[PDB]
């Protein structure tokens, strides 16, 4: 048996990080060419996410076909071995998961015009291999990368972030322990703007905190967005070098 705190007077957290550090970010494009039109493998901390974009293609049922826009579908597979303690049941039908899937759809319905691929279907399959806090933000980044890899038109990037709050000051990018310890805010940010695609608060949060917490998240998300551009451009430079 043990006990632990949140934020020490020395400005140190349970894992050793300070109040404003992003975890290790690794990004990966075109990971499954023979399985999808677009694919991305995300590593944000201990989080490991495979994202597959299949489409635009013919619908399997003509009943479900829109002549004005493409049909966008997202299925999140949170594996039974994503956490330390293996879950006995499947999480697929869980109301918490249905809300997550619904949330993500609502977010990107306004971010892709989805008016230039009529009579087609875009299927997005996601596999969460490992989970360690901020899984929603990582899900957002995985879809954005995979969609771009598929050459599917969109207006801008959508970057996802996780916020942790203790006392006066929130902690950027929370892990499971911190998530357990304190309420968190998940932010969907469009491009380099201040506009949120997704605002998600599931636990109690003082009303004074949010304005400042939002400010920290937006600044951090911009850094994340910059990294993503670097991640793809860098890969392109590396790929070109490999070709040479």
């Amino acid at each position: 048996m043990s006990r632990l705190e949140i934020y020490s007077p020395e400005g140190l957290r349970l894992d050793g990080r300070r109040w404003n550090e992003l975890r290790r970010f690794e990004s990966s494009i075109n990971t499954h060419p023979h399985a999808a039109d677009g694919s991305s493998y995300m590593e944000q901390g201990n989080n490991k996410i495979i994202t597959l974009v299949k489409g635009p293609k013919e619908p399997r049922l003509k009943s479900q076909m829109d002549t004005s826009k493409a049909l966008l579908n997202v299925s999140v597979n949170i594996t039974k071995f994503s956490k330390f303690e293996r879950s006995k049941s499947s999480h697929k039908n869980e109301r918490r998961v249905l809300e997550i899937q619904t949330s993500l759809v609502r977010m990107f319905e306004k971010n892709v015009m989805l008016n230039i691929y009529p009579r087609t279907v875009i299927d997005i399959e996601i596999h969460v291999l490992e989970q360690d806090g901020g899984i929603m933000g990582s899900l957002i980044n995985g879809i954005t990368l995979a969609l771009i890899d598929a050459g599917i038109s969109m207006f801008d990037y959508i970057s996802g972030i996780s916020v942790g709050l203790y006392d006066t000051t929130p902690l950027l990018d929370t892990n499971s322990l911190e998530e357990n310890a304190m309420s968190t805010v998940t932010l969907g940010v469009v491009g380099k703007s201040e506009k949120l695609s997704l605002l998600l608060v599931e636990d109690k949060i003082p009303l004074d905190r949010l304005e400042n917490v939002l400010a920290i998240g937006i600044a951090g998300a911009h850094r994340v967005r910059d990294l993503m551009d670097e991640e793809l451009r860098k890969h392109a430079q590396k790929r070109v070098s490999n070709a040479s």
Partner: protein, 298 residues
Amino acid sequence: KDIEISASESKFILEALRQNYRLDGRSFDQFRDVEITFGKEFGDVSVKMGNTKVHCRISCQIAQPYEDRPFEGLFVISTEISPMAGSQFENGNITGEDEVLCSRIIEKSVRRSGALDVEGLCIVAGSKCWAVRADVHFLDCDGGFIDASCIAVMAGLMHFKKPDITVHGEQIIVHPVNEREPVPLGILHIPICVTFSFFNPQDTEENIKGETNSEISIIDATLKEELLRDGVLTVTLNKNREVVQVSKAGGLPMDALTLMKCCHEAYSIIEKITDQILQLLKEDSEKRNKYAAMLTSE
């Protein structure tokens, strides 16, 4: 089944919103008055917002707690839609986009938020626990289902009383309402849900860069206004000066400033609603006994 709306209606209502006008003759920050009616039994509450009619029923029964939580009771919220609220709804459709959202908003507002003291639902640890159930019935629809439901669940829970219990280990005699009075369920806070609908002006001319058309945002939209909105926002606030939960999935992209303004506007509404809800709980509590003072011990 897809509802049919005339192109003429879509142009009329949109243009009216640019002229700060709406069909039901309301304001943009105005919320339709909420009427709360209590039935004979405790936990029976009827919420009415204009034409919108919802009914909630609170019930409980002796059950055994989960292995993971031996000190906590059980609490579930049901919001199954039916064709009674309109033929647009499929019977038992509990996986549709709007249905799952609404189900998740209520859950994050009441269940997850810990509005109900589930620890006080335990009779004997790891053995017997009360199982409170909130059943929401969507009688008819004129929009604002999420707002109606949150009011309905909370008013019901605060209304509700559970038979008094004497516990001696594993044996408990549940006193009937005849034998002794029932006990009210514990509440930690009173969450209120506000729904915001966003729109686009579609107008050629804007008078100034400094002052602009910006974005259309109304509160508690009707059925006709709900079909034409380009964005959905639901913020839950209480009288404790804190945000219970807020859910924005996609829709029309908005600034962090705009969300705050909606959040601050909603706070003035949830204050009036909470006090009003308490008042109708006070009026119904004193209502029940014609002779209660004659009745009293203390």
